[PDB]
């Protein structure tokens, strides 16, 4: 009933983790439109490092393309491809 | 090479997802301490509801206890049990 220290420390250490991101977060200039889904699942560096002086940063990145719907008011319904940045590897580095 | 719409929609829709949470956010009366790890993995509601009139909120919660290392000035390195809130179910509900 108690998670042991090494399991917690290893599970929370800097690594790529599926993160749910709002599309307006990645592309603020498109806040004028409506997307469906409004958020997408992306692999992004997350977790903590052994020291507050370090930070979890990506060391390998790539683009992933998803089928997203977008619609402007009183206008036709569009479906197309949208690219998002994904993090493939992460490391604790000086900030 | 493209994630299909239904796949994106299902995976991004409001549900409990492994989130990495800083301990200080969860224990604000202990911001004096240094914790190791400084963050923990917890199940928390995430994703979108695909309607600005709705938000993703927890409807069922439970506790989980983890071994965390703790230290503060005038004290040595301790290891202790700390309980955290988890989300077992989420639903989309008016704002």
């Amino acid at each position: 009933e108690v998670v042991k220290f090494m399991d917690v420390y290893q599970r929370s250490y800097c690594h790529p983790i599926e993160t749910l991101v709002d599309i307006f977060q990645e592309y603020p200039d498109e806040i004028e439109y409506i997307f469906k889904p409004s958020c997408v699942p992306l692999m992004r560096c997350g977790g903590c490092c052994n020291d507050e002086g370090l930070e979890c940063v990506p060391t390998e990145e790539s683009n992933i393309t998803m089928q997203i719907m977008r619609i402007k008011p009183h206008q036709g319904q569009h479906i197309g491809e949208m690219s998002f940045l994904q993090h493939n590897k992460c490391e604790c580095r000086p900030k | 090479e493209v994630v299909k719409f239904m796949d994106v929609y299902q995976r991004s829709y409001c549900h409990p997802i492994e989130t990495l949470v800083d301990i200080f956010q969860e224990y604000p009366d202990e911001i004096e301490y240094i914790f190791k790890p400084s963050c923990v993995p917890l199940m928390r509601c995430g994703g979108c509801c695909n309607d600005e009139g709705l938000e993703c909120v927890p409807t069922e919660e439970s506790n989980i206890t983890m071994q965390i290392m703790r230290i503060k000035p005038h004290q040595g390195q301790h290891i202790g049990e700390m309980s955290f809130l988890q989300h077992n179910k989420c639903e989309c509900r008016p704002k």
């Binding site: 220290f5 090494m6 420390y9 250490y13 490092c49 052994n50 604790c92 | 190791k36 290392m69």
Partner: peptide, 14 residues
């Protein structure tokens, strides 16, 4: 026990 890498147990206890 380098600080930029994931630790094992002994890094914590000693």
């Amino acid at each position: 026990c380098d600080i930029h890498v994931l630790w094992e147990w002994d890094c914590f206890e000693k």
